[model samples]
Target: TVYDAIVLGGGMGGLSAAIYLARYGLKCLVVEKGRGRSFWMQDLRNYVGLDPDTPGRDIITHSTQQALHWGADLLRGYVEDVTDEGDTLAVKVKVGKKDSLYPIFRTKYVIAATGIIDNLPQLEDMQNVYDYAGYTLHVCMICDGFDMWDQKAVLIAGTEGQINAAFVLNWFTPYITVLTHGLCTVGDEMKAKLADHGYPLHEAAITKFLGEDHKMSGVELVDGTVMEATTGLINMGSVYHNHYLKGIEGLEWDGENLVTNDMAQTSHPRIFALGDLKKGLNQVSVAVADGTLAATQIWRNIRRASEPRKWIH
Candidate 1:
């Protein structure tokens, strides 16, 4: 059966779009790979009307149920590829396992809501990485910069491009230290600039994050040096989940993000991209708004097409 729209992710953005589309009496399918970045968020306070201690997992769970209750089909699978078949879109999905049989579903419109994955600090033991991440530490500076105010903050950068994150953190606190994590690509000019700004730069490999009760206190370097930090920001960057659309043509892109109009419609009218996967703010509220706008625009287009207009001559 052809659906009115197929949302490519089950995060807040996709779920929001699904709820709106389903409530509008349009059949929609939400394909989720599960464990989105939002799922790992333990303290989601910034969102309006939500408890400061609420976990991101709870928000996604509630949103998913709401969308399902609105009659949207939620599928547990990964989209392998999407092809534009004239008036419809053929979405090939792999269910259950990596080598599982693929099924192609046809839909009138496609909403690409697959967000992004943050690049974590490389450690010998990954468990050590998780112990501090999403707790007193964070990946998004905009979301948690205020939390680092007046605190000794550490910025873990993986590349030279990530150096700018130190300047951004300065807005919240003057006490900032940058750890390159063994990546010595930061040029001398940038290092001198950082020194001029009183931001100490450490070029050493991180051994582990020291903390208790999911709060990071400091980081241990490979050379037996430990640096104290009340809060931490990781500027390693992120990976966008849009490789499935690599086969599709005519999709406008801004670097790694998909480009969409004000209504969240992509270059192709039948395709829409939203959330972090699109070129915009990587906030939960922004993503929800994108989903709402995309759903409304799609509903308007479909409703107008389905209705007959009388020509007055």
Candidate 2:
């Protein structure tokens, strides 16, 4: 069906944008692949205006209900591709376990709120470690960094992509250590620079994590050596779910994520991207703000296009 705008992903950003678009009298559809990561949040202390200790699931439920009340429709489906046909965007969705393909929402504009997935270490004992993944072994520095300031911490880097993460974590803690997990792609020059900045590198393969209270106390090395820390941040980096935009020209990539300008507009005039998929700090508040901006832009674009030009004469 045709719509004014189609938002991909039902995470914080997509749902938020759908609400704003619906309120602006525009038809919007949110296509989600699965239950979003927001459902996995144990507690969200960073979403603005809410109690700092709010649960992520509660936030998701409330925001989702608000969007639905505003006339946004949420669908459970996986987008396989996005094809730009002149001024319109066509979305291909995989409907169910049968892998049935369906055309879902042809629109003038597309917003990709597609989030990211974290790269995890393949240790034999991960369930034990993940039991504390969100509590003490967090991923986002923006969310939990302040809580960990001055606390002994471990920054696990499984690849060269983690250099940026190491740089970010340097601001909050002095007792920062990098666990390289047998990745030699990190050059010697970068290694020296990291040490110069006071973050040490451990090249040993990790055996497992230690602790029991839904929080990691330290990481154990392959040599049975235990590197202790009160908290740890996994810096392995992220993979964006942008498989749909594969052949769409002009969607800029910033090496790691899709790049968007101030209005949440991508290089392609009719398409916009937000949330974890775009180049910006990822957070619930930031995602919601991006959604609002994208909706505003979409409304303006649609209204301008719909208005007649006869009055200008």
Candidate 3:
């Protein structure tokens, strides 16, 4: 059976798109990989227009319910590959423990909402730090910097190629210390600026994280020096999860995320992407907006194609 749309990743963006598409009277199917990270997200308060203390699970549950009420079919399966067939797209899904494969649905359009995953520091002692203070060790500077101002923090990174470390120091905290993790190529200008701001750079290799009772107390250097700190924000990089769509014809992908226009249409005609998979602002509100816009454009296109034309002279 053919569907009007198949949404990949049942997280925020995918569910948002499914809701809109179902409301538009389109037959949409949502293929989710596992339970999704939404289940693990602790809070969603910072999301614009949402209650300041709302939990992430509430947002996801409400979105899922709305989509289901609107007649969108939700399937629990892992997407293995995506192939474009003329105007339709084929989604190969893996199901059950043995990884059985099946062609779940053929759809006229596809929306990829796969989100990025963060790479955290690899110190054995940092495991407790993450468990107890995960919220304190934020990744997005724009999202959590205000809560972290004037707080002593460690900025850990393998490479400072993006200038994120310097940017974080200048904008977020005054008492910041950067640990290069054995890569000593920090530029002199950056080093000088950090010093001018009173934020020193530590080049010593991190021997271990020093914490007590699940609370991070400080970071220990290889030379037996321990620097105490209450909080630490890791600047480690991110990895996008849209690798399955690689090499597909007519799809435009930004280095970090997929490319979409004002209407959320992909490079290929009849394809649209919403949420974290599409490049733009990576917020829940922006993702929902993309979903609504894509549905509207798709409905208009269907209407135009179905309209009967008058005979020309």
Q: lDDT (CA) for every model shown?
A: 0.90, 0.83, 0.73
Residue-wise C-alpha lDDT for candidate 1, range 1-313, written one tens digit per residue: 9999999999978988999999999999999988989999988768899988889899989999999998999899998899989899999999978569899999999999999999987889999989878888888888888888989988989777788878878999999999999976689889899999999988889998988988888889998888898788988889988877877788888988888999999988799998999998999899999999999999998998896767989
Steric clashes per prediction? 0, 0, 0
lDDT of 3 by residue, 4-81 (tens): 888887778888888888988889898877545455455554776787556567877788888999999988787777
Which numbered prediction scores highest in TM-score against the true structure?
Answer: 1
| Cα TM-score per model | 0.96, 0.90, 0.86
lDDT score, candidate 2, position 71: 93
Model 1, which residues run further than 4 Å from truth? 308-313
At residue 162, candidate 2 shows an lDDT of 74
- 1-313 per-residue lDDT for model 2 (tens digits): 6889889988889988998999999989888786566766677886657887777778777877888899988878898889989979898888886857686568889999878887767687778666877788888888889988988898888767676587778789878888888865678888888879888778888888888777677788897777778888888876778888987997788886878989889999988888888888888888888999999999998888796757554
Q: Superposing all C-alpha atoms, what RMSD in Å does each candidate have to the true structure?
A: 2.6, 3.2, 3.9
Native-to-model Cα distance after best TM-score fit, residue 23 in candidate 1, in Å:
0.8
Q: Hey, what RMSD does candidate 1 come out at? A: 2.6
Candidates arranged by lDDT, highest first: 1, 2, 3
